[PDB]
Protein backbone atom coordinates (compact mmCIF):
# COMPACT_ATOMS: atom_id res chain seq x y z
CA UNK A 1 0.00 0.00 0.00
CA UNK A 2 2.96 2.33 -0.38
CA UNK A 3 2.63 3.52 -3.83
CA UNK A 4 6.21 2.87 -4.78
CA UNK A 5 6.54 -0.64 -3.47
CA UNK A 6 5.32 -2.98 -6.22
CA UNK A 7 4.66 -6.66 -6.65
CA UNK A 8 7.04 -8.43 -9.04
CA UNK A 9 5.12 -9.83 -12.04
CA UNK A 10 5.99 -11.57 -15.32
CA UNK A 11 7.10 -9.66 -18.41
CA UNK A 12 5.58 -9.94 -21.84
CA UNK A 13 8.42 -8.01 -23.40
CA UNK A 14 11.67 -9.89 -23.11
CA UNK A 15 13.82 -6.74 -23.23
CA UNK A 16 16.37 -6.98 -20.42
CA UNK A 17 16.49 -3.23 -19.97
CA UNK A 18 12.77 -2.50 -19.42
CA UNK A 19 10.23 -2.76 -16.65
CA UNK A 20 6.57 -1.92 -17.01
CA UNK A 21 3.93 -0.19 -14.90
CA UNK A 22 0.21 0.62 -15.39
CA UNK A 23 -0.26 4.21 -16.68
CA UNK A 24 -2.34 5.08 -13.51
CA UNK A 25 0.58 3.85 -11.30
CA UNK A 26 3.09 5.86 -13.38
CA UNK A 27 0.83 8.91 -13.01
CA UNK A 28 0.73 8.39 -9.24
CA UNK A 29 4.56 8.22 -9.17
CA UNK A 30 5.13 11.24 -11.50
CA UNK A 31 7.19 8.88 -13.65
CA UNK A 32 7.63 9.47 -17.34
CA UNK A 33 7.65 6.75 -20.07
CA UNK A 34 11.29 6.15 -21.00
CA UNK A 35 12.68 7.42 -17.72
CA UNK A 36 15.56 5.56 -16.08
CA UNK A 37 14.49 4.08 -12.79
CA UNK A 38 16.39 2.48 -9.91
CA UNK A 39 15.00 -0.70 -8.49
CA UNK A 40 15.75 -2.33 -5.24
CA UNK A 41 15.27 -5.92 -4.28
CA UNK A 42 17.04 -8.26 -1.95
CA UNK A 43 19.78 -7.24 0.26
CA UNK A 44 21.34 -4.36 -1.48
CA UNK A 45 20.60 -5.84 -4.87
CA UNK A 46 19.81 -3.10 -7.33
CA UNK A 47 19.11 -2.63 -10.98
CA UNK A 48 18.71 0.27 -13.32
CA UNK A 49 16.03 -0.01 -16.08
CA UNK A 50 13.89 2.08 -18.46
CA UNK A 51 10.20 2.32 -17.32
CA UNK A 52 7.40 1.70 -19.90
CA UNK A 53 3.60 1.83 -19.41
CA UNK A 54 1.48 -1.25 -19.97
CA UNK A 55 -2.33 -0.96 -19.82
CA UNK A 56 -2.65 -4.68 -19.15
CA UNK A 57 -0.51 -4.50 -15.93
CA UNK A 58 -2.20 -4.10 -12.48
CA UNK A 59 -1.61 -0.80 -10.81
CA UNK A 60 0.17 -2.60 -7.87
CA UNK A 61 2.44 -4.89 -9.97
CA UNK A 62 5.66 -4.37 -12.03
CA UNK A 63 6.41 -6.44 -15.12
CA UNK A 64 10.10 -7.47 -15.11
CA UNK A 65 11.74 -10.26 -17.04
CA UNK A 66 13.79 -13.14 -15.61
CA UNK A 67 17.18 -11.40 -16.24
CA UNK A 68 16.10 -8.44 -14.04
CA UNK A 69 14.47 -10.62 -11.42
CA UNK A 70 17.66 -12.71 -11.10
CA UNK A 71 19.80 -9.52 -10.82
CA UNK A 72 17.48 -8.41 -8.01
CA UNK A 73 17.34 -11.87 -6.50
CA UNK A 74 13.56 -11.68 -6.48
CA UNK A 75 10.84 -14.08 -7.49
CA UNK A 76 7.45 -13.48 -8.93
CA UNK A 77 5.20 -12.29 -6.15
CA UNK A 78 8.03 -10.55 -4.19
CA UNK A 79 7.85 -6.84 -3.42
CA UNK A 80 10.25 -4.29 -4.95
CA UNK A 81 10.93 -0.53 -4.62
CA UNK A 82 11.03 1.70 -7.64
CA UNK A 83 12.36 5.21 -7.58
CA UNK A 84 13.78 7.53 -10.20
CA UNK A 85 17.43 7.19 -10.94
CA UNK A 86 18.62 10.65 -10.83
CA UNK A 87 21.59 10.73 -13.18
CA UNK A 88 23.14 7.90 -14.95
CA UNK A 89 25.97 8.99 -17.15
CA UNK A 90 27.00 7.62 -20.52
CA UNK A 91 29.57 4.85 -20.25
CA UNK A 92 33.22 5.41 -21.32
CA UNK A 93 34.14 1.84 -20.92
CA UNK A 94 32.69 -1.40 -19.73
CA UNK A 95 34.32 -4.79 -19.01
CA UNK A 96 32.14 -7.85 -19.51
CA UNK A 97 32.95 -11.51 -19.20
CA UNK A 98 31.14 -14.38 -20.97
CA UNK A 99 29.80 -17.26 -18.79
CA UNK A 100 29.26 -21.03 -19.68
CA UNK A 101 33.32 -13.80 -31.81
CA UNK A 102 31.22 -12.37 -29.01
CA UNK A 103 31.40 -8.76 -29.96
CA UNK A 104 30.07 -9.02 -33.45
CA UNK A 105 27.48 -11.66 -32.85
CA UNK A 106 26.19 -10.75 -29.45
CA UNK A 107 27.39 -7.61 -27.67
CA UNK A 108 27.38 -5.13 -30.50
CA UNK A 109 23.92 -5.88 -31.84
CA UNK A 110 22.71 -6.01 -28.22
CA UNK A 111 23.88 -2.50 -27.37
CA UNK A 112 23.76 -0.72 -30.65
CA UNK A 113 21.34 2.17 -30.59
CA UNK A 114 19.64 0.85 -27.46
CA UNK A 115 21.12 3.12 -24.85
CA UNK A 116 20.78 0.36 -22.30
CA UNK A 117 21.40 1.05 -18.62
CA UNK A 118 23.84 -1.42 -17.07
CA UNK A 119 25.20 -2.06 -13.57
CA UNK A 120 28.37 -3.62 -12.24
CA UNK A 121 27.64 -7.20 -11.30
CA UNK A 122 24.71 -7.64 -13.74
CA UNK A 123 24.33 -10.94 -15.44
CA UNK A 124 22.55 -10.56 -18.79
CA UNK A 125 21.45 -12.92 -21.60
CA UNK A 126 21.93 -12.06 -25.22
CA UNK A 127 20.22 -13.98 -28.11
CA UNK A 128 21.90 -14.45 -31.48
CA UNK A 129 23.84 -17.10 -33.39
CA UNK A 130 23.23 -20.72 -32.29
CA UNK A 131 22.70 -20.39 -28.54
CA UNK A 132 21.93 -17.52 -26.22
CA UNK A 133 24.95 -16.42 -24.18
CA UNK A 134 25.12 -14.87 -20.74
CA UNK A 135 27.61 -12.15 -19.89
CA UNK A 136 28.62 -10.64 -16.55
CA UNK A 137 29.47 -7.00 -16.11
CA UNK A 138 32.71 -6.94 -14.18
CA UNK A 139 33.15 -3.17 -14.13
CA UNK A 140 31.83 -0.04 -15.71
CA UNK A 141 33.29 3.41 -15.96
CA UNK A 142 31.62 5.42 -14.43
CA UNK A 143 30.85 2.86 -11.78
CA UNK A 144 28.65 1.31 -10.71
CA UNK A 145 26.26 2.04 -13.59
CA UNK A 146 26.06 3.89 -16.88
CA UNK A 147 24.14 4.08 -20.17
CA UNK A 148 25.86 2.08 -22.91
CA UNK A 149 26.31 4.62 -25.67
CA UNK A 150 27.58 4.22 -29.23
CA UNK A 151 30.95 5.63 -28.13
CA UNK A 152 31.16 3.41 -25.04
CA UNK A 153 34.28 1.13 -25.31
CA UNK A 154 33.36 -2.56 -24.84
CA UNK A 155 36.08 -4.74 -23.31
CA UNK A 156 35.20 -8.41 -23.52
CA UNK A 157 37.38 -11.19 -22.01
Amino acid sequence: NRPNRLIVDEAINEDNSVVSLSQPKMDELQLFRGDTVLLKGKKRREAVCIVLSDDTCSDEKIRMNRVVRNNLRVRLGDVISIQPCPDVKYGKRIHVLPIDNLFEVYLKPYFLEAYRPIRKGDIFLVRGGMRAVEFKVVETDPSPYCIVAPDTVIHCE
Binding site: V18, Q23, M26, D27, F32, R33, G34, D35, I50, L52, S53, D87, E113, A114, Y115
Partner: protein, 65 residues
Protein backbone atom coordinates in the same frame (compact mmCIF):
# COMPACT_ATOMS: atom_id res chain seq x y z
CA UNK B 1 3.83 17.64 -19.86
CA UNK B 2 7.12 16.33 -21.14
CA UNK B 3 10.10 15.51 -18.97
CA UNK B 4 13.39 16.78 -20.50
CA UNK B 5 16.89 15.64 -19.51
CA UNK B 6 20.41 16.23 -20.84
CA UNK B 7 22.63 19.22 -21.78
CA UNK B 8 22.71 20.15 -18.07
CA UNK B 9 18.98 20.52 -17.59
CA UNK B 10 16.34 18.36 -15.91
CA UNK B 11 12.80 19.82 -16.02
CA UNK B 12 9.24 18.96 -16.73
CA UNK B 13 8.01 21.11 -19.52
CA UNK B 14 4.40 22.01 -20.17
CA UNK B 15 3.09 23.01 -23.51
CA UNK B 16 0.32 23.15 -26.04
CA UNK B 17 -1.76 20.05 -26.50
CA UNK B 18 -1.26 20.44 -30.25
CA UNK B 19 2.29 21.64 -29.93
CA UNK B 20 5.13 21.66 -32.36
CA UNK B 21 8.81 20.75 -32.34
CA UNK B 22 9.93 24.41 -32.55
CA UNK B 23 7.87 25.45 -29.52
CA UNK B 24 9.46 22.54 -27.64
CA UNK B 25 13.00 23.69 -28.57
CA UNK B 26 11.99 27.23 -27.51
CA UNK B 27 10.67 26.16 -24.06
CA UNK B 28 14.06 24.47 -23.42
CA UNK B 29 16.45 27.41 -22.69
CA UNK B 30 19.48 25.56 -24.09
CA UNK B 31 21.33 24.86 -27.34
CA UNK B 32 19.90 21.42 -28.27
CA UNK B 33 21.93 19.20 -30.67
CA UNK B 34 19.94 15.90 -30.53
CA UNK B 35 16.69 14.47 -29.14
CA UNK B 36 16.02 10.87 -28.30
CA UNK B 37 12.58 9.41 -27.42
CA UNK B 38 10.01 6.62 -27.34
CA UNK B 39 10.28 2.78 -27.41
CA UNK B 40 12.06 1.33 -29.36
CA UNK B 41 14.09 4.56 -29.13
CA UNK B 42 14.16 6.92 -32.16
CA UNK B 43 16.68 9.69 -32.72
CA UNK B 44 16.46 13.29 -34.02
CA UNK B 45 19.27 15.64 -35.09
CA UNK B 46 18.61 19.30 -34.62
CA UNK B 47 21.62 20.70 -36.45
CA UNK B 48 8.67 22.01 -37.80
CA UNK B 49 6.11 19.29 -37.19
CA UNK B 50 3.49 18.84 -34.51
CA UNK B 51 5.02 16.85 -31.64
CA UNK B 52 1.99 14.64 -32.12
CA UNK B 53 3.15 13.57 -35.46
CA UNK B 54 6.30 11.69 -34.44
CA UNK B 55 4.68 9.83 -31.54
CA UNK B 56 5.62 12.04 -28.63
CA UNK B 57 2.71 12.22 -26.13
CA UNK B 58 2.05 13.68 -22.66
CA UNK B 59 3.78 11.90 -19.71
CA UNK B 60 6.77 10.84 -21.85
CA UNK B 61 10.47 11.53 -21.46
CA UNK B 62 12.82 13.28 -23.92
CA UNK B 63 16.57 12.92 -23.62
CA UNK B 64 18.61 15.73 -25.18
CA UNK B 65 22.32 16.24 -26.01
Amino acid sequence: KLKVTGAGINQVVTLKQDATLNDLIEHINVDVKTMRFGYPPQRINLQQTQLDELGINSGEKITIE
